[PDB]
Design a protein around this motif. Sequence first.
Motif, short mmCIF file in Angstrom:
data_model
loop_
_atom_site.label_atom_id
_atom_site.label_comp_id
_atom_site.label_asym_id
_atom_site.label_seq_id
_atom_site.Cartn_x
_atom_site.Cartn_y
_atom_site.Cartn_z
N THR A 167 0.96 -1.17 -0.11
CA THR A 167 -0.11 -0.11 -0.09
C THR A 167 0.81 1.25 -0.11
O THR A 167 2.02 1.08 0.05
N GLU A 168 0.22 2.30 -0.25
CA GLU A 168 0.77 3.52 -0.25
C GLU A 168 0.50 4.41 0.87
O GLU A 168 -0.44 4.98 0.96
N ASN A 174 -3.32 2.77 9.71
CA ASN A 174 -3.72 4.14 9.36
C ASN A 174 -4.26 4.82 10.77
O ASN A 174 -3.73 5.90 11.24
N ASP A 181 -0.15 6.89 3.80
CA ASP A 181 -0.58 8.25 4.00
C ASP A 181 0.27 9.20 4.71
O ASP A 181 -0.10 9.53 5.77
#
Lengths: 138, 82, 779, 69, 15
Positions: free
Chosen positions: C443-444, C553, C446
């Motif tokens: 995943t990128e 996250n 954030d």
Amino acid sequence: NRQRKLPEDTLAIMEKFILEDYETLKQKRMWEVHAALVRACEEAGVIAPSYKAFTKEVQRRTGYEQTKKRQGRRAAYQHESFYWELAITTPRHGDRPFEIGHIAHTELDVELVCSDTGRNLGRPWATFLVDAYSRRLL
Amino acid sequence: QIRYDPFNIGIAYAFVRGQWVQCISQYYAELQGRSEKELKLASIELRKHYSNHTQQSKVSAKNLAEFLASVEAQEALLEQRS
Amino acid sequence: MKEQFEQWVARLQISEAGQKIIEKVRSSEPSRRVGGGSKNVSGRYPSRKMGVTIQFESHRVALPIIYQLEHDKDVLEFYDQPPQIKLDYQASNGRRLGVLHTPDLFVIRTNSAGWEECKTEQDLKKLAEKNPNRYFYSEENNQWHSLPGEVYANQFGLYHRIHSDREINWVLQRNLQFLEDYYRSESLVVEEAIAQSLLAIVSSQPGITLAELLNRSTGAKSDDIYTLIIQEQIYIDLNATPLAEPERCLIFRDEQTASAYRLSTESWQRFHQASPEDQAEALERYKTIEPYLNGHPPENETIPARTIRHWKAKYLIAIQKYGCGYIGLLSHRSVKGNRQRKLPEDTLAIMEKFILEDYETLKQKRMWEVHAALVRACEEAGVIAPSYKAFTKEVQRRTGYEQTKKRQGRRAAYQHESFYWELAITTPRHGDRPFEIGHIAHTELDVELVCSDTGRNLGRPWATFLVDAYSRRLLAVYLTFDSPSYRSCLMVLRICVKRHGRLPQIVVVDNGAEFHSVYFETLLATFECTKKQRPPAKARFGSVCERLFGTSNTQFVHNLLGNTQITRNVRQVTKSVNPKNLAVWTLGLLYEYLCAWAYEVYDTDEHPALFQSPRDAFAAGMAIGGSRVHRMIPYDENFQILTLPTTSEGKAKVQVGRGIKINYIYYWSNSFRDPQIENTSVQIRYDPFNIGIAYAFVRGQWVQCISQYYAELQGRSEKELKLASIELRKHYSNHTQQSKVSAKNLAEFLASVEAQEALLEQRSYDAEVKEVFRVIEGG
Amino acid sequence: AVYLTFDSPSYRSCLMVLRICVKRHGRLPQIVVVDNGAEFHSVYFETLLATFECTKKQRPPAKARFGSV
Amino acid sequence: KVGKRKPKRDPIGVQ
Ligand SMILES: [Mg+2]
Ligand SMILES: [Mg+2]
Ligand SMILES: [Mg+2]
């Protein structure tokens, strides 16, 4: 019973945590800031609040301040106070046609194809001049 | 409207369209092929289980708070460094 | 190898053409690579019988048969995607058509050989009901048969068989997946004293459960017990009760002793038709009538006499002709109502047609416009036009997957797709023990990162997670600025085999490129990991992994400065809130704290699906399921050179005085001076993070090789090499003279260019990931 | 009939002890005497009792002599 | 197809 049930020190500490750890340019979730508040309360020896208390006092501070200290001014712009005319100044939309007219550009949400070679030309741009009195597309 | 068997996680009953209708979970297939005596004991065991886990949110929150406090200390150090 | 096959043919007297087909199948690559499709989890499985990777289209249909064949003794070999057979068959009409078909497996056994095709239940029924002369059921042997497949088998001395998933015993599959780790070992030697101790404890007590034997303090472990299990010293039926549940598995010394030890309805339906409100009303009627049924009627009764009499009469009627009289007091309000459609039939038909052909269409038209068009058409047709509320209500009756797919697409309709609900005990979704199913996903993150030294923004790092599906424990975490590329994969797996010990058994991995590459597949084959692939655009197949991103996250990433959270609303972004001006973190510190969260914060946190912390679940599982020390991969130099990638060919020539040519550069070693390995092909491995060092397989050992530009090509990565090569080719394309790309031009490009924005970005990325490497290595 | 459970006392603890009594005896006591409060009040309990021609009685609060046995 | 590895039968085991 309009009297508060939590002790005043807990109220002050929760207000401080909401101001300085929830209204920040980080968009912290309520659970983590509540956990930090509980840890600070336990160090301070004050009665800790519940998660419901934190959520209820956060949903009571909602508005311009929260949306600007969380997401910015362009996001709080939806939570703006309108202008309500008590007296009658010059009308906002126009006393007669061709008095106030608005210019505005946009790009139409449609992909356009060429009329000769048929490749994708991208989305076009439409500009509108509108008579603000009758809302007519001049 | 819903009804549940304290002696069976795998089973529930819901009122749909005018029919008490059987409802399947997961501890049903996972508890398929066993007797009706150990099924109820495992059922009670999983009730307290799923409860008691809801109550331990305080310890998870405290550990998260300590980790985030260390994170914020590093945040302040590295922001003052710049 | 050839002599034994020849004797097999002679013993079974296979014809010349049959021997030709068997020889072709034996020596041929599979016809087609298995495709992901849209509903099948595909992939490859390492087989020690053949000793190669075998491809399965379905992990729950063909893969169980593959497991059987791999652990079956009667089977000698089992090839996959055998060459196409032109099956000739007459259809329902009568035309004899020849259709090319590829059998799932080609199985050669100790007394016969032929084709075996794996299908499911519903597939077999639809194919039989749509093709009478292509499939049919024989209830005698209870087997599905295909006419042209078996005909072709009988014209060639071979057999044809259809394997369905009705006959597969899933307990056998679970136990095979349990003991596959011990099967893959080659030198299982249990200590004689401990084996004798277990033999005594087993012979002293028949029918002893596995759980009640493991808990005994005999100075033994579970690896020992399962090793005795796999060598048939202790007999456990791997057909009835799984070993993952050790409380329902009786242990016996041999098979013979185990065998000896083993050797009214309508009224109730009326109750099922009742509502809680109807139940309360029946209760009220019973409470009203009850004083009248005991000879003590009340002197204050508001309910009139006729209703009391009717209730009593129906009570008696039910107690007479049903069996219980309470069931005669049921109201069943649900039947009442006017369900007749009030619109005319032509109005319906037209409005159905318009909802079908003007609303669920690739335009996302609003309901008002489609209603207006429908009203116009109705007024043209002289029929009644339904109101707008009727249109909205019926459109609300078509919601789910079909409408979302026919309006937005298959990606958006995936939310309302379906849940596969388990009826029986198939193989568990999230495995049975630690280190069984591990998911890999990237995943990128954030979060914006600034340069460690110069302080310029570098972007959002990429996070690669390998996580086991059993205990949810984040097995390995990696952070790098680059896009998804093998290096990613070498890394997560290096750490896996570094701080933990081994590696998964079944590794799911989406349909990336990093996973369709040759390097990752070759490495998984080398370390014997079953590679499983989710279908494209489907995310639930790695769901357990993917949600672990979201937690990262909320618990660590969104609680940092410069997070890329407010950029989801791009339309509301200003220069005062852009994270590229608020970012202060670096790659090394972010990776360090992410590792801290994944290894001691989330690791000690209780899970809803386990009622224990992931480390506790891991410890309990590896205590019950054995440590499996044999499958440990030691993190040493051998593994270091084994993880490193290579070129497409695999080997390079040793030119005299120059060495081996890898990625436009030349590498030399002292041992290359020996003429024995001069002007010959030797296997090569290249270090992606240090170009100036490679390895070559010489005289049964990997030996290091240093390029001729060590002072100028040490510490650089290979992505920077391709960047330099492309820029060099473009710069020489700015001139007509054709100067070929060699090592020296790249060397002076690296030693001369210092201010190129893309090249500087690349060097910054490498310098940043170097600190992540140091953090991994203990620094 | 005996029920051991982790749940707090309520009509759940009676609708399942009557079930065990029916399991090991096949019938129901004609008059079932239970505890007071709003935790033992339901529609399913009373409809079960009224189905098989049974009766429910509730002791008064703060007087355990009725349940002294 | 495009970017898809040839259907090679990969050997297994650590040499
Ligand atoms: Mg505009
Ligand atoms: Mg727009
Ligand atoms: Mg993300």
